[PDB]
């Protein structure tokens, strides 16, 4: 279900493997910002969701440092997986950059990403 290759509305590709113990591992490649190539993704999911047709809660993080670039920032996505003919993951994200004390009021961006198993 969650395991597979996902794309957000921006071209980004996230390759995610769901483990049997609630672990989420994989790789992100962003189509925007200060990023190049692949970045390590790690997260957790609810490995035994409700019966009742509710979604599957999950979250993951990417720190935007790899061997090519370092953006001194990290993003966390929080959302739910919803099965169906068109499986989708709906998330909200927080992106925090490292700042000095004086600039911390403006260190965090917030947005929403919708992931699909079909590239837009």
């Amino acid at each position: 279900g969650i395991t597979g290759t996902w794309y957000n509305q921006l071209g980004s590709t996230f390759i995610v493997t769901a483990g049997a113990d609630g672990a989420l591992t994989g790789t992100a490649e962003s189509a925007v910002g200060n990023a190049e190539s692949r970045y390590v993704l790690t997260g957790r999911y609810d490995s035994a969701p409700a019966t009742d047709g509710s979604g599957t809660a999950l979250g993951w993080t990417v720190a935007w440092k790899n061997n090519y670039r370092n953006a001194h920032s990290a993003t966390t996505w929080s959302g739910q997986y919803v099965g169906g003919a068109e499986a989708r993951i709906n998330t909200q994200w927080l992106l925090t950059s490292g700042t000095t004390e004086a600039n911390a009021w403006k260190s965090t961006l917030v947005g929403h990403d919708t992931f699909t198993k079909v590239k837009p």
Copy 2:
């Protein structure tokens, strides 16, 4: 300065180990209230007195309990004698499509070594 025990303003206790290549692993917490954490951090931060960007996730499921939800914390570690982690968090619960609009809470937490 990150590896160790951190406490938030709620009493809760977080034990985190920060690996050499940017992994964060540990637990949030008796057994029944203990949960797994996994995250990532900037292992090569700037020198300019900037904070170290990081983030982590906890799904609220263990062997004993399952709240069908996950929290992510996004934030930065600040050093010194008043070492702190300042974060904002998102908590999402699994919902039906009908109730998705109220699936996510937002808030902030501050973690201290004491």
Copy 3:
């Protein structure tokens, strides 16, 4: 371009009046009053027009002890829309304040 009737994704109807001094007044449809501000002198370079508004969910008939604020921008053009993120806060006791605030997003269109 902002003044008029707007519809978000779950059919709610917002009637918005943009005043020349930057004020936004109108109603969200039971029916509640809205009030906000917008940039009454945006850039002409394709940038959007920044805005925000608030609805407290109390009227003559019902009270939910909560308020929502929408923060976003207007984008004009053939398919004008207002893209927003929102925060919904409910009155809670001090000990439930951690769970007093929801976050989401809303898109408004003219049809």
Copy 4:
């Protein structure tokens, strides 16, 4: 209660008037107009009073092409406070929309 002069943790000054059926009006300060709403009939059980307001960062001297909304609750008591979370959106292009909005939190007191 809510009417008065409020200061946030960074020292900015908000002068707020609470109107009879839930209007918030006032200024933030370099001085800008604020507008919002609040629950004029809060719960008696000890809960806080839900509210929100907006400031568009345009006045007669400067315009940053951006707007902030605060969502939160007023807590009466020893330290009357207003605990909020805020969103600041800047007018951007289509291409830069994904990075248009910052989020944070603010505590206000009369001290």
